[PDB]
Design a binder for this molecule. Sequence first.
Ligand SMILES: Nc1ncnc2c1ncn2[C@@H]1O[C@@H]2COP(=O)(O)O[C@H]2[C@H]1O
Ligand SMILES: Nc1ncnc2c1ncn2[C@@H]1O[C@@H]2COP(=O)(O)O[C@H]2[C@H]1O
Ligand SMILES: [Cl-]
Ligand SMILES: [Cl-]
Ligand SMILES: [Cl-]
Lengths: 200, 203
Amino acid sequence: DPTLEWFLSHCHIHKYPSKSTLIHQGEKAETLYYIVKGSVAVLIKDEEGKEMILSYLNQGDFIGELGLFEEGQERSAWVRAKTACEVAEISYKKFRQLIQVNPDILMRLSSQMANRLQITSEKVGNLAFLDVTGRIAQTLLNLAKQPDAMTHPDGMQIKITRQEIGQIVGCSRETVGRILKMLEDQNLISAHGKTIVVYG
Amino acid sequence: PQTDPTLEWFLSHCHIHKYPSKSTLIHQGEKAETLYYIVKGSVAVLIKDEEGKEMILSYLNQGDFIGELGLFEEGQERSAWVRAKTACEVAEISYKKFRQLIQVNPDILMRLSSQMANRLQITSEKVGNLAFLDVTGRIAQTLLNLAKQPDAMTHPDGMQIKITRQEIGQIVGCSRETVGRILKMLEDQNLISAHGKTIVVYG
Ligand SMILES: Nc1ncnc2c1ncn2[C@@H]1O[C@@H]2COP(=O)(O)O[C@H]2[C@H]1O
Ligand SMILES: Nc1ncnc2c1ncn2[C@@H]1O[C@@H]2COP(=O)(O)O[C@H]2[C@H]1O
Ligand SMILES: [Cl-]
Ligand SMILES: [Cl-]
Ligand SMILES: [Cl-]
């Protein structure tokens, strides 16, 4: 589409190796990014440096957009490359100029911010009233009904690790372990290495 | 609370409607064709968990856009209910008309997008608190957050807020009973005072 091509023609595409930290929470924001190729993780941390993934972002996603609208904004989160990444970069100053020329580019960015807000809002509603057990159970049941869940003699099989469960619900890997054992004993799931079976 | 030429130009293209306290501005799931802007008053943005329990996702106040999430893609449905907390005065404009205003002066889209960005930050922090903080910490953080809403009073011991235990539970994501037990504890810890329907957050 011509809007994205026009936008990219004003950007400088950079290549970063896997595990690069592209954005550090707390730093001064003066640049907008757009993923041309690759995937990243958006993360927040607690005092002990524990973690919760807010989102994965991929090809076609803007990153670092939240500091664009007000002066002196700081990065709201960490963004770390999951794979090697090809990322277009443009100063906020230049981007603001592009918006006056053709605001459709700001409509595209804002469309992504709107979706992100709806997704993050839904996660608040889904997790707020539950304790860690409730959150883990809901998480597994939700994954069991997604298209990539596979058929199993015992029910629906999902691919997920104790670590990434903990990253979704914001708890330790050990707590996940204990809760998965409990869910097995209640005859709701079966856990086998890096896969879980939710009983139907 | 602070308008500017861009906003008054925008408002000159809108119709301002009044909404009594408790009335619904927006119903979740309805087709979105209208953008709102609060001239006066406050609203609550509500969503429900998988058991049908209602949460207060955010309050919005004078100067806030509402109903913007449906503007960017066709056939979008409202993501939440929005109901008046006080009597409100709200400017309305069709998405069709607003898209034309954007072409006339994109600064109005910058104003709207700025709020969307702020909301994402705020909501992201809330999702992090759900995990990083215990229930006590979540209630304590909500009390602070509420001590900074415009409707917050001054007090010789700190900031005095007006909110029901029910409402604290809907913001935090816990039961009214839990809130009661935690406010008592915080009171005994000399961090707050609960004078009936009022709470004083010490500073
Ligand atoms: N809830 C979220 N969902 C998706 N992306 C996010 C979320 N919160 C922050 N980000 C992204 O992470 C970036 C961190 O830097 P910025 O705050 O400039 O811009 C932020 C967004 O691009
Ligand atoms: N997390 C949030 N913070 C503040 N306001 C929100 C949030 N989620 C939804 N809203 C508002 O509630 C509105 C419901 O209708 P829309 O989805 O059109 O637009 C939505 C936003 O204006
Ligand atoms: Cl509606
Ligand atoms: Cl807890
Ligand atoms: Cl009360």
